[PDB]
mmCIF file of C-alpha atoms and ligand atoms in Angstrom:
data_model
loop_
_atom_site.group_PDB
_atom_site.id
_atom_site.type_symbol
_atom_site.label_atom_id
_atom_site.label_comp_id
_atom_site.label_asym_id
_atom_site.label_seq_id
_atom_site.Cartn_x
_atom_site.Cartn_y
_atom_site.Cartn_z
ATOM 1 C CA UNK A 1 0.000 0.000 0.000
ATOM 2 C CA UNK A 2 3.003 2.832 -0.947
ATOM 3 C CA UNK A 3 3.190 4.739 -4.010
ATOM 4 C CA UNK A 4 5.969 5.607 -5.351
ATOM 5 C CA UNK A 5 7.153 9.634 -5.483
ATOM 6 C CA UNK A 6 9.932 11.807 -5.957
ATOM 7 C CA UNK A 7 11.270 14.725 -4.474
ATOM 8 C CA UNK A 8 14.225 16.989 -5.824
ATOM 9 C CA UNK A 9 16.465 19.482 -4.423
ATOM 10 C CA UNK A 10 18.702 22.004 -6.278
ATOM 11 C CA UNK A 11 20.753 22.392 -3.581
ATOM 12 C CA UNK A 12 23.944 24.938 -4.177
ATOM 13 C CA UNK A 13 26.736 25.899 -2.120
ATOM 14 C CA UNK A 14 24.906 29.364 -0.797
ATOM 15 C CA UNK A 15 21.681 28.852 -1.425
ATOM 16 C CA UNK A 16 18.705 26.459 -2.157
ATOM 17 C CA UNK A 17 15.950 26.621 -4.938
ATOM 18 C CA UNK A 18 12.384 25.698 -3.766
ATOM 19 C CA UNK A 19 9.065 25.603 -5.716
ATOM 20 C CA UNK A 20 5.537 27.560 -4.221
ATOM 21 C CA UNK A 21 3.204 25.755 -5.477
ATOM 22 C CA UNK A 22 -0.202 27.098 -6.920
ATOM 23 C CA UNK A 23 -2.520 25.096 -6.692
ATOM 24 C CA UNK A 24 -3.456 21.136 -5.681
ATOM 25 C CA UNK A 25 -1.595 18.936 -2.998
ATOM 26 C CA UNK A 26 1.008 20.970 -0.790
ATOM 27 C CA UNK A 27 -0.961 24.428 -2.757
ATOM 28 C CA UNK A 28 0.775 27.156 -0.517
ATOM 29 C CA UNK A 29 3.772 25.399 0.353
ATOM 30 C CA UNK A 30 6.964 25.987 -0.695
ATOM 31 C CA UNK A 31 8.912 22.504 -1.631
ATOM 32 C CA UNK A 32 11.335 20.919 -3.624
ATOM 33 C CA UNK A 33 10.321 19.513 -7.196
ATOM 34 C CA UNK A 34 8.657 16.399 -7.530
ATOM 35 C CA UNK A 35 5.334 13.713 -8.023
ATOM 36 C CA UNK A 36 4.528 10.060 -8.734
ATOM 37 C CA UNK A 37 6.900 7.827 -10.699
ATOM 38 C CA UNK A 38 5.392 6.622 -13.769
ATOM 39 C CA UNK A 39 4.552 3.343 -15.412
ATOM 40 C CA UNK A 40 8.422 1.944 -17.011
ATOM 41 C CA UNK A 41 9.997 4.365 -15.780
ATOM 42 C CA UNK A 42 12.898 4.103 -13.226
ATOM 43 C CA UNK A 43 12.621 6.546 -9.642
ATOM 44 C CA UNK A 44 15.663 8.286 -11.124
ATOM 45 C CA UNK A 45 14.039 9.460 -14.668
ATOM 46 C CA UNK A 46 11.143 10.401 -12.669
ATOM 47 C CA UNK A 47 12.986 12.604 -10.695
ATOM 48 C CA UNK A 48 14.693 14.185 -13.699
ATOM 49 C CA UNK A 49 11.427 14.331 -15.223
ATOM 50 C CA UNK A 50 9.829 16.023 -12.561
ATOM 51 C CA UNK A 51 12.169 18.503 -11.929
ATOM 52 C CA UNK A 52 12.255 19.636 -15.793
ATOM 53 C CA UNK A 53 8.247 19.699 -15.644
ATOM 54 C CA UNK A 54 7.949 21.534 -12.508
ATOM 55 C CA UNK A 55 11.218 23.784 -12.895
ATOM 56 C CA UNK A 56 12.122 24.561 -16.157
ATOM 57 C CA UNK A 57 15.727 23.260 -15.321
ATOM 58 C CA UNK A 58 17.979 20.384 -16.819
ATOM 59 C CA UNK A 59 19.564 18.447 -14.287
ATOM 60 C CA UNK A 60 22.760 15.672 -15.835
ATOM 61 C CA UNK A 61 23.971 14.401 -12.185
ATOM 62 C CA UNK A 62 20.774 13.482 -9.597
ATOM 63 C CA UNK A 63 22.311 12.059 -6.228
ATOM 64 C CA UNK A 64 19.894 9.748 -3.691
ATOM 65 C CA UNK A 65 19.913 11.076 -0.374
ATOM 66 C CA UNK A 66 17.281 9.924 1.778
ATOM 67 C CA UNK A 67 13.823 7.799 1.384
ATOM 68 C CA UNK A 68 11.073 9.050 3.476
ATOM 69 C CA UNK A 69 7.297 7.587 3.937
ATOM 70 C CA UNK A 70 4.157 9.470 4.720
ATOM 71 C CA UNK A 71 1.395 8.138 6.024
ATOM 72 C CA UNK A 72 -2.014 10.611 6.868
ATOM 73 C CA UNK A 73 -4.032 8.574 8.851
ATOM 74 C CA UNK A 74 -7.528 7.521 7.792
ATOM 75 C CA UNK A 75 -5.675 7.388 3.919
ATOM 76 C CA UNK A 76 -5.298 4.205 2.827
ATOM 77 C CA UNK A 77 -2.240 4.981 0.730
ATOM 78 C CA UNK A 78 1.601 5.769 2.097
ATOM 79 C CA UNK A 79 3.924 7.774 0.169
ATOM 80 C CA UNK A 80 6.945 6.242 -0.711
ATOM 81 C CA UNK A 81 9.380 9.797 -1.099
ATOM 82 C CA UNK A 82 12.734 8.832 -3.159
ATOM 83 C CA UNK A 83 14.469 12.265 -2.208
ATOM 84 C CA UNK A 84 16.994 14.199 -4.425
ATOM 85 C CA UNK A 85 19.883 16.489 -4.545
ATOM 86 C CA UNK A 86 22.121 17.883 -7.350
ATOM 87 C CA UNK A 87 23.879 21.609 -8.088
ATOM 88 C CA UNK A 88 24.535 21.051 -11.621
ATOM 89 C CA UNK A 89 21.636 22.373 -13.444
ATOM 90 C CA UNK A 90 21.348 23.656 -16.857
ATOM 91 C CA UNK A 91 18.695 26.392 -17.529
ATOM 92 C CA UNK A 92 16.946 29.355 -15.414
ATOM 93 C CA UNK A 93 13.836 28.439 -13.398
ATOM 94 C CA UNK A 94 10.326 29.393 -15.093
ATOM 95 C CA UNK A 95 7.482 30.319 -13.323
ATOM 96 C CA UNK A 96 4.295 28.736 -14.921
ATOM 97 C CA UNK A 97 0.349 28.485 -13.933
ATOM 98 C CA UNK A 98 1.935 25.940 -11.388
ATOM 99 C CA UNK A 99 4.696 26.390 -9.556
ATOM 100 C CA UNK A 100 6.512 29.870 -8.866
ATOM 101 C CA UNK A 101 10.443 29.589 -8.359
ATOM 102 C CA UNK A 102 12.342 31.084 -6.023
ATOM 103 C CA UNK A 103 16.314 30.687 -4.860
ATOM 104 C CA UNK A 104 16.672 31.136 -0.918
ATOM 105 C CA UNK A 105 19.997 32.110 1.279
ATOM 106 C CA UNK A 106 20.503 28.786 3.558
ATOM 107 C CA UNK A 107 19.839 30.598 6.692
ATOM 108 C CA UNK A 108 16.777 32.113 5.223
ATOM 109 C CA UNK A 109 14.840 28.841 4.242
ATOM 110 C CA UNK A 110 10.958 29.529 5.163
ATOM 111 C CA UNK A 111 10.619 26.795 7.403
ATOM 112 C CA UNK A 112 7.298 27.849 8.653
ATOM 113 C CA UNK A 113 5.656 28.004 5.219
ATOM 114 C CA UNK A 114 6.930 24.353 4.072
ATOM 115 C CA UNK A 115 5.296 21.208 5.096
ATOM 116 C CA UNK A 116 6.326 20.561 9.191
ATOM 117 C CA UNK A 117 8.243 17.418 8.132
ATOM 118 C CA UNK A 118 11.119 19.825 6.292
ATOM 119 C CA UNK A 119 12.168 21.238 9.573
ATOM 120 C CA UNK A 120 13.519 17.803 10.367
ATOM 121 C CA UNK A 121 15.216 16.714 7.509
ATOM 122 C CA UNK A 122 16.597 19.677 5.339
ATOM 123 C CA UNK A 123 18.859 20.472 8.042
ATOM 124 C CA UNK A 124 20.934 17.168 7.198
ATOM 125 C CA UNK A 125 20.079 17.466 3.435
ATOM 126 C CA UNK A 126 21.855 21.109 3.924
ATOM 127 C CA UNK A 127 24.981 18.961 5.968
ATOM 128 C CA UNK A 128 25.244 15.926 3.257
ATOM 129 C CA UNK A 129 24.005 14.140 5.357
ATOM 130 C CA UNK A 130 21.620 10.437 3.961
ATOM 131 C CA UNK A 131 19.060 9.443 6.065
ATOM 132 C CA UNK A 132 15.604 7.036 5.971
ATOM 133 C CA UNK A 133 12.719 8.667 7.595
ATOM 134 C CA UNK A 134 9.313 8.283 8.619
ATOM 135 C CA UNK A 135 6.524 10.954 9.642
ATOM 136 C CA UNK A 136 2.704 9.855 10.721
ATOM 137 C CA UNK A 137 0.136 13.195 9.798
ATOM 138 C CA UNK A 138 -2.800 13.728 10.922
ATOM 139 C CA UNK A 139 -4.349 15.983 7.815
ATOM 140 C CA UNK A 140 -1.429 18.085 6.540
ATOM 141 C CA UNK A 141 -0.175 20.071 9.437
ATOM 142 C CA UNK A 142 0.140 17.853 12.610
ATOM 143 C CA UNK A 143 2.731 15.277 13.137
ATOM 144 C CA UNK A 144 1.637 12.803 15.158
ATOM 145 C CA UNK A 145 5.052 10.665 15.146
ATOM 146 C CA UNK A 146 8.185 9.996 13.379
ATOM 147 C CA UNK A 147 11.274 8.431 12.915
ATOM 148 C CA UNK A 148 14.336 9.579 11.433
ATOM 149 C CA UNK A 149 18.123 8.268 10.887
ATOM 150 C CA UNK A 150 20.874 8.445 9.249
ATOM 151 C CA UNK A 151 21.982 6.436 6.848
ATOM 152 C CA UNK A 152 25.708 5.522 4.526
ATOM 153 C CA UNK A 153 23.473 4.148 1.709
ATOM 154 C CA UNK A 154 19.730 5.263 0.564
HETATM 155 N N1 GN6 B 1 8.780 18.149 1.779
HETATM 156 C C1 GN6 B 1 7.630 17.445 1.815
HETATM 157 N N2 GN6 B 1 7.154 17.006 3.025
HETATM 158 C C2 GN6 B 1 6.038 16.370 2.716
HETATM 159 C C3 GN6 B 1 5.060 15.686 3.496
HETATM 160 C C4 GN6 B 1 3.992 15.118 2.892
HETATM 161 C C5 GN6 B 1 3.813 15.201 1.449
HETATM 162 C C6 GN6 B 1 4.731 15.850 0.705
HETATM 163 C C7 GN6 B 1 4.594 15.973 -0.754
HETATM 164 C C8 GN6 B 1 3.483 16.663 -1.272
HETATM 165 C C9 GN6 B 1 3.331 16.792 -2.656
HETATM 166 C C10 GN6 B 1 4.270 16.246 -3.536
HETATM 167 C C11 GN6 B 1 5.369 15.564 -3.020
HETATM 168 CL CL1 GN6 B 1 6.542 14.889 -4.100
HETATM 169 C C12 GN6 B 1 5.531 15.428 -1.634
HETATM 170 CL CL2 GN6 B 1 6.910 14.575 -1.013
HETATM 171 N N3 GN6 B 1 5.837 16.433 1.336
HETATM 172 N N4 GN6 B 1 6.862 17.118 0.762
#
């Protein structure tokens, strides 16, 4: 009962692009780039894919570094998050109907307006850090529970 998604970071040395979305799931949020893997295709293209669709950018060199599943309680389905990082792009970000762009300072990430889990995790996404995680919601602002480690391999 997980489905399979991705989530990608553009993660440079001073600074971190993030994605508000406009409208749907995580509308209002600010988050990386990302959404279900497709039929025959491998988490990795997805994750490229996403990030072109949602972006604008080209990305060559995608590196794993964490796996974390969401479950909202009272939804049958978990998430199954195959997270992302890379700082070689090609391309400037595009702001579409969608998704509006925006590069943030690393002490200047807007924790408060990004879904609770982030304020968790980025922190060792930001220290290259791997890790495996876990958070339990209860609609899409309260964590009930969680787990997180680190990890040498995704
Ligand atoms: N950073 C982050 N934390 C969460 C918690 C629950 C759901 C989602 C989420 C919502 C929409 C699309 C995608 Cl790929 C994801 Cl991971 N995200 N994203």
């Amino acid at each position: 009962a997980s489905r399979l998604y991705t989530l990608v970071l553009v993660l440079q040395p001073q600074r971190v692009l993030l994605g508000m979305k406009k409208r749907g799931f995580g509308a209002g949020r600010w988050n990386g780039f990302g959404g279900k893997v497709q039929e025959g295709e491998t988490i990795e293209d997805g994750a490229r894919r996403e990030l072109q669709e949602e972006s604008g950018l080209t990305v060559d060199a995608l590196h794993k570094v964490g796996q974390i599943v969401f479950e909202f309680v009272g939804e049958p389905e978990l998430m199954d998050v195959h997270v992302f990082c890379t700082d070689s792009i090609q391309g400037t970000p595009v702001e579409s109907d969608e998704m509006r762009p925006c590069w943030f300072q690393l002490d200047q990430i807007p924790f408060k307006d990004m879904w609770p889990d982030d304020s968790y995790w980025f922190p060792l996404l930001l220290q290259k850090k791997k890790f495996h995680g876990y958070f339990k919601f209860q609609g899409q602002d309260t964590i009930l529970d969680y787990t997180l480690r680190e990890v040498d391999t995704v």
